[PDB]
Design an enzyme around this catalytic site. Structure first.
Site, PDB file in Angstrom:
ATOM      1  N   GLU D  38       6.123   0.474 -12.938  1.00  0.00           N
ATOM      2  CA  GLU D  38       6.518   1.336 -11.852  1.00  0.00           C
ATOM      3  C   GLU D  38       7.993   1.294 -11.666  1.00  0.00           C
ATOM      4  O   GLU D  38       8.570   0.232 -11.599  1.00  0.00           O
ATOM      5  CB  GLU D  38       5.866   0.887 -10.576  1.00  0.00           C
ATOM      6  N   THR D  67       8.168   3.438  -4.143  1.00  0.00           N
ATOM      7  CA  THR D  67       9.059   3.630  -2.997  1.00  0.00           C
ATOM      8  C   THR D  67       9.239   5.114  -2.683  1.00  0.00           C
ATOM      9  O   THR D  67      10.330   5.569  -2.341  1.00  0.00           O
ATOM     10  CB  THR D  67      10.413   2.940  -3.213  1.00  0.00           C
ATOM     11  N   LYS D 127      -2.521  -0.429  -1.576  1.00  0.00           N
ATOM     12  CA  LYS D 127      -1.479  -1.403  -1.854  1.00  0.00           C
ATOM     13  C   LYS D 127      -1.316  -2.302  -0.635  1.00  0.00           C
ATOM     14  O   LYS D 127      -1.205  -1.812   0.492  1.00  0.00           O
ATOM     15  CB  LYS D 127      -0.165  -0.696  -2.183  1.00  0.00           C
TER      16      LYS D 127
END
Ligand code: NA
Ligand code: NA
Ligand code: NA
Lengths: 201, 70, 70, 201, 201, 70, 70, 70, 70
Positions: D38, D67, D127
């Site tokens: 990622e 993000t 998450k």
């Protein structure tokens, strides 16, 4: 604003059973070097306490209002002469009807979802409450994704763990029961201890 | 009828300001009852003067609204 | 419209009451500034309580008037 | 997707100061054995990095964007070819508008109220951020009322405490600073160590 | 219903894989002295268990429904005869639809923002979930700004740390796996031990 | 009147696509200025080709809406 | 409707500008592919910045066009 | 057209009650299958009685709404 | 509107079906009370299942009717 917290690095959070204790302890805290003082609205007749501390405001103190959970309490606190407003939570109306006032509002967050909702409203300095539940590791973990956000942790800040909070990278610390409890002359020594310790971290 | 609603809005603004100031005056009176002082009475006089000014502003706005509604 | 103007009459009466009470409060504050006393402060507290009641009455009447005009 | 996290069991969250270090470290992590990577949208020109790592996709890598706090960032990341989108928070509009594209979105939660909101939005894999603040105790405690929710913890996952997280019952772990700091060959050695440890326990 | 929590001071949160096991353990924990019991809506056919436990209701038990995440589940549980409703999260729709029903609702919070949102809906007794992630320090910290809120912590309450929770000032405790794991005669002894220690310290 | 809003939505979609693609092209140019490579230039060429296609689509849709307004 | 056709005129002018600029960018990218240079990459950056500004202009004009239709 | 709409409101309320009670009856039937008992059968009979009452209420409301609709 | 009266007709049909099925369920419950059996419980389960289906059908018809009225 940014620079007062950045320079003084300590805010006293006043809880009191009555208004005269609050005024005596605000004076004693200012006589130890702490120039940022917060009167919480759990103190009875708190806007009156903020109004009758303008002499300290002329000597160099910055007085603000805490535990604000309403838009009418913010009006009352700005009328009485408070220079900043603080909440233990995030409210969208206390923030949108404070942006228009031109008053500094510092909301409280504990999760990064509240953090992003506060950033979307324009808030860069946030209150971290309760700070002893999350610890300095929350501040270090927020560095990566959110590098511009500064925290003022409130809750469970002692002499022993105040250097850890500044190593983590906080802007200032809000100290409560470890400053303002005891007689109004023990507070005058606790304030000096804190102010010198923070300058030796 | 929109020049009526703008006045009905200015009056609500003034009324909220007056209600906040009255609460502050009540708190200050309680604080003075518990521990009388001189600076407290000077501040109370200042607050009452502000309240008088706000009441005059309210009456001006409401007389203008009365002249338009007529 | 007679609903509207009756509410206007109500509000005007209330505003006259409020202005008279505020003037009396200012006078009593000046008298307390020169000679303080506890009965004077209890009377001041009672006057402020009546002022709060009058402000609440005015607010209701004004919100009903604004609801009707809407 | 569910199958890739279940199979590979580790995602490399990658933060860097520039784009060339990001590409170097992504290559090194893929050499170490980590197939899920990622690129955080905090790395300068991160959509360019995602676009220029398409050669690894044929080797077998899965590349995603992290993000992501906007819908424009989700668009920019799907354009350059991100397989999945990750966010440190739960955003309802990003979910609304990413479900219409068919892209895999993994929001971040910290409390059960945010969890139930994500579930109402359709999210079964969440998450857990910051993972080090809540611990594996949070994952064990959520099994009762919410059996179907699976977590990918991100935040302070080490070589020591990864077996704890996997005993608690997590799909995969996102490893950041413990994995991707250092020179690009120490990163390869760290990736090897992490893969070996995760397959051990 | 606040009086019942204040009097009995323990609620048995009951999760089972069957309805017969649920009924067995409800009776067993009532024999130990636990008058407040909650059947989680994760137990198969839970409204049926709530409906068939009326013989215990006539003996002095208070039966309620937990893990409610829908308004239809609230309707079903109130039909089946539940005295109170509990949620691991906070939901505004369930609250505003249970207020008109006149039924007692105890939402679950983890953060001061959720806490203030629940208070604005009228909830004074909140459930603190997960209680082992925040701890009794959370309750001690919430005392200050929010003096009128009572907590019923759920999650990780053992024999050891229950007196800690009560010194922190909680109204009652919700005990789950420490209380209801085992045979229907181990559960009775565990309930006796819990009740005896709670009335002890 | 409904073809008009259809074409307006079409144009808004195309313009969002075009702005995102321009952002990506700018980022890729900044990356190439520092580390030059042939694969980066081939990817830049593909992005510019997609941008040309999007501009043509936008131009067709705008001419059709201009005809409808005529 | 005259406001609307003036907005259409402005938008068509901007779109022709954008199309010319995208053609120039494609040509410069081909030239850079065949012979790399750094001043060529600086000029490409300048052209991409111009393109961003033009897209912004188009988008802030289309908001007005849609709002007037709305 | 307002009586019609409140009749629709009432029928929707009754329908939700009936749906919930049928769910409870299904659950209780499955519980009885796994481990039979006589108190369970008495409770099932009571639930079915309630269901009959709710169906009668639904029908006497639908007759009124069909009377008004024509 | 004949769409609305058609929906009323279909609702009446479904309601008669549900009434008959609830009556049969009540009879079967009484027979099971008097002399328990397992095949009787399987038949009761089947009847409750088809009752759920009919309730769903009635729901999706009344949603359309309320849609059309309001
Ligand atoms: Na304000
Ligand atoms: Na997207
Ligand atoms: Na309910």
């Amino acid at each position: 604003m940014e620079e007062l917290f950045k320079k003084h690095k300590i805010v006293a959070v006043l809880r009191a059973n009555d208004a005269q204790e609050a005024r005596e302890k605000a004076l004693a805290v200012f006589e130890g070097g702490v120039h940022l003082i917060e009167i919480t609205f759990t103190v009875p007749n708190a806007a009156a306490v903020i109004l009758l501390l303008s002499f300290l405001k002329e000597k160099g103190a910055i007085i603000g209002a805490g535990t604000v959970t309403s838009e009418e309490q913010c009006a009352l606190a700005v009328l009485s002469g408070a220079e900043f407003i603080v909440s233990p939570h995030l409210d969208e109306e206390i923030s949108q009807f404070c942006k228009e006032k031109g008053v500094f509002y510092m909301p409280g967050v504990m999760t990064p979802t509240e953090l992003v909702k506060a950033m979307k409203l324009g808030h860069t300095i946030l209150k971290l409450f309760p700070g002893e539940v999350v610890g300095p590791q929350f501040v270090k973990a927020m560095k990566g994704p959110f590098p511009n956000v500064k925290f003022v942790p409130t809750g469970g800040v002692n002499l022993d763990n105040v250097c850890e909070w500044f190593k983590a990278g906080v802007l200032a610390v809000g100290v409560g029961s470890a400053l303002v409890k005891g007689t109004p002359d023990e507070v005058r020594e606790k304030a000096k201890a804190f102010v010198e310790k923070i300058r030796g971290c | 009828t929109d020049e009526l609603l703008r006045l009905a809005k200015e009056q609500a603004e003034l009324l909220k300001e007056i209600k906040i100031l009255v609460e502050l005056i009540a708190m200050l009176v309680k604080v003075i009852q518990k521990d009388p002082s001189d600076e407290a009475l000077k501040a109370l006089a200042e607050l009452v003067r502000k309240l008088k000014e706000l009441v005059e502003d309210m009456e001006r706005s409401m007389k203008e609204q009365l002249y338009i509604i007529k």
